[PDB]
Amino acid sequence: EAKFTEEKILWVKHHTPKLITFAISRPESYRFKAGQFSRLGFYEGKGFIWRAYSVVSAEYADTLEYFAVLIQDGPMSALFAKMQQGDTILLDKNATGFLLPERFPDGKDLVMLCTGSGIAPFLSILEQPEIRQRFDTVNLIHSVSFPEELIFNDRLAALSEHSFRFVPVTTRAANPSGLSGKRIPELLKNNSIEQALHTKLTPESTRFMICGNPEMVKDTFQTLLDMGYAMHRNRIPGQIMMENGF
């Protein structure tokens, strides 16, 4: 039949004026792997608008949750700003994406590097019980500009205290819980992330996932290549998986 279903907005939560999470109804048939993204849409007049969002809720949850940043003059953002419980939202029947951590072998140290809304797929991955079982440590570094944008900080700091480590990074504001004033590629170069994790990072033992703004993803990838890491490919184990967050 159609390539999508009509779902309902269940609720919208403002964490700041411009950062929302929201939940939608989940059809019985909708399957995804943690780390993948949905395509969400609205009827607009006689046409459509569609955008991709990483699922932030657990694979086993009974709803689908998403984390969206509201962009000035952005067309989907204007619709998100007006939507409310009971409104129709369209859900593409297929989930997509290759941020699939179980393609890395058990026993490694998993290091997730993200910016902004790029934390979203890693939230779903952290809800998989087997991820902290399979990997020796699970580490999440979330870079934003200002500490107000660390909207999962209280939750992830509490989970932090097979260890889970959370390192917040604020690139434009000085936060005397994490690291401040520098972006993730620089913090890899100067060993600050390794020091914050209290875990030596090596190509043999570390496996990276990257999700963030395109410039950060590129700069982080190139930095890791300089440090001796390689992309995961079909036949290459490698140490890096990456996806642009927009």
Ligand SMILES: Cc1cc2nc3c(=O)[nH]c(=O)nc-3n(C[C@H](O)[C@H](O)[C@H](O)COP(=O)(O)OP(=O)(O)OC[C@H]3O[C@@H](n4cnc5c(N)ncnc54)[C@H](O)[C@@H]3O)c2cc1C
């Ligand atoms: C695979 C994939 C996964 C995505 N996952 C998410 C997600 O989990 N959460 C989310 O909020 N967005 C996500 N995005 C972006 C999302 O699809 C939209 O682009 C976003 O909601 C803005 O839509 P818009 O129509 O208001 O603006 P658009 O017309 O789509 O974009 C306008 C401009 O806003 C900027 N922009 C867009 N999205 C972002 C963002 N998230 N952070 C910073 N700047 C941005 C870009 O400069 C873009 O050119 C994803 C995109 C892709 C391709």
Ligand SMILES: [Cl-]
């Ligand atoms: Cl609502």
Ligand SMILES: [Cl-]
């Ligand atoms: Cl599923």
Ligand SMILES: [Cl-]
């Ligand atoms: Cl959930």
Ligand SMILES: [Cl-]
């Ligand atoms: Cl903006």
Ligand SMILES: [Cl-]
């Ligand atoms: Cl509606």
Ligand SMILES: [Cl-]
């Ligand atoms: Cl797979």
Ligand SMILES: [Cl-]
């Ligand atoms: Cl970002």
Ligand SMILES: [Cl-]
């Ligand atoms: Cl956060």
Ligand SMILES: [Cl-]
């Ligand atoms: Cl500034």
Ligand SMILES: [Cl-]
């Ligand atoms: Cl700038």
Ligand SMILES: [Cl-]
């Ligand atoms: Cl400051």
Ligand SMILES: [Cl-]
């Ligand atoms: Cl960064």
Ligand SMILES: [Cl-]
């Ligand atoms: Cl090594």
Ligand SMILES: [Cl-]
């Ligand atoms: Cl960018």
Ligand SMILES: [Cl-]
């Ligand atoms: Cl390459």
